[PDB]
Amino acid sequence: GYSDRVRSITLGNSTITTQECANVVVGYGEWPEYLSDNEATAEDQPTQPDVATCRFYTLDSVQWENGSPGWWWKFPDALRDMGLFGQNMYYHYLGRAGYTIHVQCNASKFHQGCILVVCVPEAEMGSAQTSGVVNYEHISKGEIASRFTTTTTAEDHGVQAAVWNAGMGVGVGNLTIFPHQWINLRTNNSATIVMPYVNSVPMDNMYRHHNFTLMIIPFVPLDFSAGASTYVPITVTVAPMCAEYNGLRLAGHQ
Amino acid sequence: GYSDRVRSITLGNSTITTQECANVVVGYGEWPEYLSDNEATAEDQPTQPDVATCRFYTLDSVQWENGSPGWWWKFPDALRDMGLFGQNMYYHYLGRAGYTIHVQCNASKFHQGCILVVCVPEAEMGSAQTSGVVNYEHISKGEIASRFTTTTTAEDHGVQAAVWNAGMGVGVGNLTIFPHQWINLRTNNSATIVMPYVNSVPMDNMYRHHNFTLMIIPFVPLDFSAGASTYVPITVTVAPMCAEYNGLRLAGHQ
Amino acid sequence: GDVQNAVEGAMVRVADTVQTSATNSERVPNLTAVETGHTSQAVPGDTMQTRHVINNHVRSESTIENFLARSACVFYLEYKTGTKEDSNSFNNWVITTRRVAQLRRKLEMFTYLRFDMEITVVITSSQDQSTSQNQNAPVLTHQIMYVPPGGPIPVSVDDYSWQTSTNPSIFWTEGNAPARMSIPFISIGNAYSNFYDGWSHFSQAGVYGFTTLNNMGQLFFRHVNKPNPAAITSVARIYFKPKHVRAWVPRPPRLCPYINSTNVNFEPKPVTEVRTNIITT
Amino acid sequence: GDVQNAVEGAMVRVADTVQTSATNSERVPNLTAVETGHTSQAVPGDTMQTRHVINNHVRSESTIENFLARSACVFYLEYKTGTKEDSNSFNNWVITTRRVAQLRRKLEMFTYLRFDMEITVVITSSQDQSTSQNQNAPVLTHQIMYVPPGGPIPVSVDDYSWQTSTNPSIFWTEGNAPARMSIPFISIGNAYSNFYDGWSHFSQAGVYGFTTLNNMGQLFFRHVNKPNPAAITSVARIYFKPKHVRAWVPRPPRLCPYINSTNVNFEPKPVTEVRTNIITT
Amino acid sequence: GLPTMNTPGSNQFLTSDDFQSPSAMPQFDVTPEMHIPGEVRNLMEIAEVDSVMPINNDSAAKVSSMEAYRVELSTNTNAGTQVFGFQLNPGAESVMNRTLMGEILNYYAHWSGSIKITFVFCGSAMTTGKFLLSYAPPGAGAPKTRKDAMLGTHVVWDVGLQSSCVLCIPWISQTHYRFVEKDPYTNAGFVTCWYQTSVVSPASNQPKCYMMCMVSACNDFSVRMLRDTKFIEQTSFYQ
Amino acid sequence: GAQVSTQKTGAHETSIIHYTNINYYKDAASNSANRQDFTQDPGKFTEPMKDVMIKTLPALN
Amino acid sequence: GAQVSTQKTGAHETSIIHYTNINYYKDAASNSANRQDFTQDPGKFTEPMKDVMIKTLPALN
Numbered sequence A, B: 001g002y003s004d005r006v007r008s009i010t011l012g013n014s015t016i017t018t019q020e021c022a023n024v025v026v027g028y029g030e031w032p033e034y035l036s037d038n039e040a041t042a043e044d045q046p047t048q049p050d051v052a053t054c055r056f057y058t059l060d061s062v063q064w065e066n067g068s069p070g071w072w073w074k075f076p077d078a079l080r081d082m083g084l085f086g087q088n089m090y091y092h093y094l095g096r097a098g099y100t101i102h103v104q105c106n107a108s109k110f111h112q113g114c115i116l117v118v119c120v121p122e123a124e125m126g127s128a129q130t131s132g133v134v135n136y137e138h139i140s141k142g143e144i145a146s147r148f149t150t151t152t153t154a155e156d157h158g159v160q161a162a163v164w165n166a167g168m169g170v171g172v173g174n175l176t177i178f179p180h181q182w183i184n185l186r187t188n189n190s191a192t193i194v195m196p197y198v199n200s201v202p203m204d205n206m207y208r209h210h211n212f213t214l215m216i217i218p219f220v221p222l223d224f225s226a227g228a229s230t231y232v233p234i235t236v237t238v239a240p241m242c243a244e245y246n247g248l249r250l251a252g253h254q
Numbered sequence C, D: 001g002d003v004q005n006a007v008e009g010a011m012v013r014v015a016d017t018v019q020t021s022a023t024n025s026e027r028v029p030n031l032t033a034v035e036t037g038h039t040s041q042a043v044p045g046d047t048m049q050t051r052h053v054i055n056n057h058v059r060s061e062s063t064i065e066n067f068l069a070r071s072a073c074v075f076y077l078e079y080k081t082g083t084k085e086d087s088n089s090f091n092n093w094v095i096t097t098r099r100v101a102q103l104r105r106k107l108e109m110f111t112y113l114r115f116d117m118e119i120t121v122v123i124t125s126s127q128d129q130s131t132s133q134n135q136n137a138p139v140l141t142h143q144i145m146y147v148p149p150g151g152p153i154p155v156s157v158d159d160y161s162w163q164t165s166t167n168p169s170i171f172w173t174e175g176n177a178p179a180r181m182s183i184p185f186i187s188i189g190n191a192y193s194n195f196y197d198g199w200s201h202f203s204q205a206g207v208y209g210f211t212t213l214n215n216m217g218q219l220f221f222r223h224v225n226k227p228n229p230a231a232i233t234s235v236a237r238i239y240f241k242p243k244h245v246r247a248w249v250p251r252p253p254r255l256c257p258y259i260n261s262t263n264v265n266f267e268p269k270p271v272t273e274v275r276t277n278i279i280t281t
Numbered sequence E: 001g002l003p004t005m006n007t008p009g010s011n012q013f014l015t016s017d018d019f020q021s022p023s024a025m026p027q028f029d030v031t032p033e034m035h036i037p038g039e040v041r042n043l044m045e046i047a048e049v050d051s052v053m054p055i056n057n058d059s060a061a062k063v064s065s066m067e068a069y070r071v072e073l074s075t076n077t078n079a080g081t082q083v084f085g086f087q088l089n090p091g092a093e094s095v096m097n098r099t100l101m102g103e104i105l106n107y108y109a110h111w112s113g114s115i116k117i118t119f120v121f122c123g124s125a126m127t128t129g130k131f132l133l134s135y136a137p138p139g140a141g142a143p144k145t146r147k148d149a150m151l152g153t154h155v156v157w158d159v160g161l162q163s164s165c166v167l168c169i170p171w172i173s174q175t176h177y178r179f180v181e182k183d184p185y186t187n188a189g190f191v192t193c194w195y196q197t198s199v200v201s202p203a204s205n206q207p208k209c210y211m212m213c214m215v216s217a218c219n220d221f222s223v224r225m226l227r228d229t230k231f232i233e234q235t236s237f238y239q
Numbered sequence F, G: 001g002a003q004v005s006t007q008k009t010g011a012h013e014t015s016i017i018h019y020t021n022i023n024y025y026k027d028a029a030s031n032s033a034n035r036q037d038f039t040q041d042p043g044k045f046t047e048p049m050k051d052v053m054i055k056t057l058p059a060l061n
């Protein structure tokens, strides 16, 4: 029985299946769990919505193309509109959570191509215009994929998204130090990374701080031949885990 | 060892192999066995030819085509010419037996299509001409497949074989209540149903009564593309099990 | 269990919802293969995280007995008050399930059926219009006679056959409670057969179908009263209740409308009702 | 206690008068605060010096069961003896408590109600005036059929629906004792609701009120007899008795007269009757 | 009084009912019981008694005579020659139909069990012969030749000092019970008789002689669904 | 399987009579009316108080 | 020779009532309907498998 290629993940009213996985990466060896009485600082009772928050949210999926350079999403911000997680994040000064990230991409024995799927903590990105500063709308489109550029330039306060430097002044080939998997179309149809709350402080504001960035970068370009299905998307579905919130007031932004 | 996809069935001087099966259905949970002294009524000693009767008879195989509506065979009548089973059935007023039904159909990863394989007990079929009565030659061609029709009409005393009503005034999608399997070309190359003697009386005449009908109906049409092997047959091989016969006299029909 | 020993049950409740937690594993309860011929025994807790619910629901009324054991009309028959000369002064019915649409579809959901039966019969009368409809007509008694396959048919409203020296009969006066009998499992075979894919003759011929097996005999009806000056018409409704039931081999329920009480004929109908679009609200 | 196990009671008598003596003290049993929402549990001995009385009175007839378990008329329906052509040859009633004034006020004193019910039905007949009213009409049998929410409505006095292969029916001859049935707690919810301050649609719309919840199905009535030369009219009175009763949330009894059987509407009435002066004898 | 509620069925007269009733003659001292030989307590006891069959059934002339009971045999008759044939419908076929077994059957609609036809040779004591007594089960049709008959259930009767040989017909049926009335579904097959060799005689002996056939029900026989017989009727009462 | 119970009689001058019950039908719905349960609890309506209000004491203090 | 049995009542808020049966006739056919046997075995229809199909495992392997 039990082929290790087959997997079923259930969280809240959500189940994802896969019949071609390559194990699952638990970020830095640590499974997500709630903030403990020793490590706590905000004295108020936390609200823990469990199944209502901690469930599988499918974000707007992107199309993989032969020349398409790459994509990033920012968490928790990508989830700012995803159901009751978004609401809780909107009505609370502080929030804390880990996440099951599940990237999906299927093609065929006859297709080829390989993408890096990585969760980078504190991926603080550089301004394209080195002289100037970057700004939110060029840092995150919430649940919509921000694209990496093959082109070394961009519009006013856009990030320097030139792929080989991963938007942050380093070698993209070294991104592998962060919790990652690869969807190599020969081998698998999905990636799964279970990311713990990685931060220097027990809870933080859900909007101000992008705790980590999901980067999907094609290291080997998507390819196939003579009339063999052009459209092949990449879908990212993510589930919050052990989510708890402190400091409640009115609807929040400013 | 032992992949559950692989199977070998031996009965008499007969072995069928398959390397892509989907388990085997034992009709109504019951494996075939001989008529017991409690349930018996015909007082004469039964003849039980064992290996001579109970072996694998391959009936005339039919071709599956993209638009081909479906097929049926009637038992025990389909076997009225199959070796010594046929002879025993010919020289005896009463006969009793269960059967291992094995439908065969292979195609390729690149072909598609799905057939229902079902053993319907007492499938009493309706006359196409509702006013009139049906007749044997339009009910059974012995070992040759009687076809289901896409057309809502037929020649004098032909059965109403219009597929979506399964030749018997019901929804074909509900035929699944009877012992069945499916050969979905993606999944498997064969079906196997082990049918017990299902009837309201311990033994019956082998000609008069068609105890059950084997229906093979394509729910998803056969398809493939640009120059990829047109001919793909469906072969039905069946073996009688626990066959016994009472009341012996001369060669029988009338 | 003993279907004739009524006061001896078995209480079987429905299945409870066990609480499920989150999972991340190699076991796949909702990934399977329809080809197998198997139905998925999945429970909501294999796909969602469920709470703990205690289902004290029982599958009571869906029991074959509770489903079939409600007394249905199978046929009604008519006859006037008259003389030997009047053909219409008496009547008969060859006993059959297939005459009406409703009970027939219920029974036919099963291939083979074995049961005892409660027969109730509502005989109703009405005055024929006539110059004499003014008439003091006394209370009418009625005779229902069962003639089993082989006995003498009554040729007139007034012949030796109605003596019933061996046939079962019911004499019933009007105004009283409806006549009622119980019947054993009357068949020669180990179960009644609603379907017979076969022939009346060894040579693959003669009568095709269920008709061949279901030879139940017939009910003869008459008035016992001599005729009043103006005629009175009576109509008898025969009611059947399958009790002490056992059922074998479930079938799809009849989709197409019934045509003949004699055979299983139909003309082809659509699988379901049509809708506006494949995406519907 | 088990409201279905009738022969299992509980005798609870009224409270005795304990003897009081004179007092002069700091305790004040009759000085309190209505604002609290509390009712004063004062006894006459807290205000007067009482004697010792033994109250063997019991609150018998004010039990919810003794109060509701008296068989009341909820509706009556009418139908003539006729042919398929005659619309009036049969009739129906959508089952409802709110049709009559008296039982409705009794039930509505409680918000939620759970009970079994005894239905008795008095079917009465009369001769229509006609040249033919002279006519020897035989004893009339009647059919009452319950069609649960979803089944086939009878379109005529004479169609397949009246077979009742699965619907409950009562056949009743005239002159006999009135037809009677018992009904279980038929609802889909844990108690019947006499009031629903809500909507049939999630969008705060569609049908307002109790109507939305109380879908009980309907009773179809007909004569089983063929028509006599002159017509005969029958009228069926449906009687309800709530037995094995349980009640929740008491309400003020209806002050205003009922207007619609469909909704809770009223037009405003005075709180009480007027009197001559605030000082009255 | 005690709250009774009358059910359907009330006040009907069912011919087959089994209820207690008041006697019109109370405390009647019945005539004391005596022995009387020959007590019948079950009609099958009669069906189990041997009757002689009218197999020589050819014409009204012989049917209203003793000829009906005697089947004519002859010397120098060629070997495979058929003596007689008929399908086994006890209580329906004229050959067995109105015998003791046949008559009992005719007050019932269903029968079951084995039958035994006892063949007795009433030829000259000095005469000899061998016969094939056959029973073919249904489905094939009546045995046209001694070879066809041979293939089915059979006895080869050698006539000699034991006068009579019995052909025991087995209950071989799909169903536990057949109809008494002839029905295509409940067909019971064919019983036929053939010269296995021939009837041989000495010089001043008669050439033609006779056999006769008795029939009765074996210990596995039974009958069901009680009914009136077609065998008796009237237009008016008798006087 | 008969049930014996007590009849409603009345306060006698300074008693127990019985009646018999046999349930005839397979469904509890078919049973006689539950008329003999004189049980009550006005408390929920007459006194729905979180803090217990002692009669001899002042309601407010 | 009376039989005592249990009546269909219903799930009570966090019971057993009985009824009596006496068979009046000499023929079991005459008896009440067998309505209280809520027994079932969908297995023969829902799972007619020779090899047992374990839910948590893949159907094919």
Ligand SMILES: CCCCCCCCCCCCCCCC(=O)O
Pocket (backbone or CB within 6 Å): C095, C097, C098, C107, C117, C119, C144, C145, C146, C168, C169, C170, C181, C183, C186, C192, C193, C194, C214, C216
């Ligand atoms: C007055 C006496 C009346 C006796 C009536 C005997 C009626 C026999 C009833 C036979 C019912 C057969 C049900 C067959 C069911 C089926 O296979 O469709």
Ligand SMILES: CCCCCCCCCCCCCCCC(=O)O
Pocket (backbone or CB within 6 Å): D095, D097, D098, D107, D117, D119, D144, D145, D146, D168, D169, D170, D181, D183, D186, D192, D193, D194, D214, D216
């Ligand atoms: C001939 C069979 C008749 C069966 C009749 C079934 C009648 C169902 C009765 C439902 C009563 C509902 C009482 C609702 C009380 C309320 O909420 O106002």
Ligand SMILES: *C(=O)CCCCCCCCCCCCC
Pocket (backbone or CB within 6 Å): F001, F002, F022, F023, F024, G002, G003, G004, G019, G020, G021, G022
């Ligand atoms: C317990 O029930 C046995 C006590 C004696 C019973 C007497 C029964 C009275 C007559 C029968 C009533 C049967 C109702 C179906």
Ligand SMILES: *C(=O)CCCCCCCCCCCCC
Pocket (backbone or CB within 6 Å): G001, G002, G022, G023, G024
């Ligand atoms: C067992 O049967 C004896 C228990 C007491 C029986 C009370 C009988 C009730 C009245 C008689 C019914 C007789 C039916 C023929």
